[PDB]
């Protein structure tokens with residue numbers, strides 16, 4: 001028993017991290033097969049970031065200007081290309097530690113682990129969620145660009161995020177591994193304000209199910225609600241609307257606990273309206289939304 | 305910027321996890337050099353756990369009764385011995401993935417990462433603290449025994465914990481890698497109640513410093529206090545007493561932020577007396593105590 005914010009074991013991704021330097025900029029790259037992926041802003045100086053023309057800046061770069069180092073050994077760059085906001089550096093050596101992998105573009109509400117790196121060296125691993133406004137609340141200092149987000153299914157790593165930017169509000173923006181930003185963000189140092197950071201309702205309900213499974217049951221009430229009634233309260237509290245797809249996804253947690261999804265919605269509704277009253281749920285004084293229903297099932301069953 | 309509960313990259317420890325089976329029990333082992341370390345309760349049936357005599361149970365076991373599997377390959381056991389509450393299984397093959405390592409016994413308040421494993425397979429990584437009552441609040445299902453806690457200093461892994469027990473209250477107990485339990489706990493299925501789970505004051509202060517560095521400054525007040533005055537309030541709120549050693553340890557955070565340690569103590573004192581008033585600090589509605597001052601410095605500087 002016990003319920004923790006857990007990240008995937010990072011070993012498979014650690015074997016892919018490399019350091020990429022272009023001029024005076026050093027950031028992280030992801031080495032899979034004979035390609036190194038990194039943010040295209042590696043070619044920008046701090047000055048260029050204010051209004052960069054990436055195609056024009058890239059013309060002044062040749063293969064030998066991209067310095068790729070894996071551990072303390074240099075990789076030979078034999079090609080380079082820009083795909084959206086990522087650069088793909090073809091190297092002459094396939095990464096011997098390349099795991100089975102996929103590139104996936106996640107939806108808001110989905111969680112993933114981030115391996116924060118500096119100079120191609122992993123420093124830490126944490127668990128995140130793609131917010132409904134397409135930002136992530138990460139922990140990234142200068143030099144962390146190119147650090148990646150991923151999920152693991154047994155032995156296959158699905159890479160879903162690459163770190164690019166920090167908005168003026170301290171929240172983070174990045175791309176999938178095809179170089180397309182999540183949300184409306186651009187790799188330019190300009191006014192980019194995030195939209196409403198709503199709460200991921202289906203994730204909160206999943207976490208309330210985890211709480212019940214782990215013994216924290218004080219919040220369970222004698223009420224029920226409907227999807228429409230619940231959603232009126234959810235809109236008022238800046239919670240994402242709950243759909244029948246979400247109810248279907250919570251089905252196994254409902255079955256395991258014997259608590260109908262709409263009953264849990266009514267408990268959540270009273271928690272929103274009454275507050276926690278100084279109490280905690282799974283050691284938290286607020287409603288946690290960075291566990292998906294899949295995460296709750298995985299952690300509560302022990303998927304390796 | 306941004307501040308996350310971060311675990312160390314788990315790769316170096318993943319390469320050490322093996323599956324140990326003795327009779328009908330399968331749990332995790334840690335393979336370092338030619339020794340596999342695992343909880344000695346691997347020799348117990350669920351019935352034996354009620355009142356086990358480990359020396360007597362171990363007499364009925366031979367080297368060939370301990371089945372050690374690393375990946376899908378079997379290791380040959382050429383010796384076995386009991387050291388406190390851990391079994392050391394000598395194998396004929398040194399782990400080729402053995403990192404540089406130390407065995408350390410941590411003090412309460414110290415944090416570490418746990419690589420939760422099942423059947424010798426890593427399922428997740430999370431960050432923990434040794435509580436002042438010598439329990440840990442982990443996430444461990446049946447089959448997780450033998451999962452380990454560690455800290456990494458560049459390339460050296462300091463193993464500090466091995467999971468053994470879950471108390472009837474759902475909190476966890478375990479040993480250092482010499483087999484000595486943290487706290488008064490024993491590897492027997494009997495009434496073992498934990499003492500007071502007090503808050504790790506020096507860790508809360510470190511985290512308030514992290515909050516200031518990351519822009520969350522609402523809680524800073526116009527007051528100061530003394531160690532003795534602060535400690536009177538800390539005792540009342542079940543917080544650990546703050547010592548001059550703790551003040552010394554917070555010195556670099558005080559220097560970086562320009563906020564004297566005793567001033568931060570006065571802010572913490574008002575947070576204890578007034579509460580959060582529905583506000584959050586670093587996305588938390590309660591005062592976080594599972595970041596040491598060292599962790600705050602490491603995360604805020606980018607140590608890899």
Ligand SMILES: CS(=O)(=O)c1ccc(N2CCNCC2)cc1
Pocket residue numbers: 025041042043044045046049145164165166167188189190
């Ligand atoms: C606006 S920001 O803080 O997200 C940001 C600003 C600058 C950069 N650099 C790219 C690498 N070359 C140096 C400049 C990257 C991100």
Ligand SMILES: CS(=O)(=O)c1ccc(N2CCNCC2)cc1
Pocket residue numbers: 329345346347348349350353449468469470471492493494
């Ligand atoms: C009291 S408890 O839940 O912490 C616990 C109970 C039993 C066990 N087993 C050891 C391995 N063999 C089967 C029994 C381990 C821990």
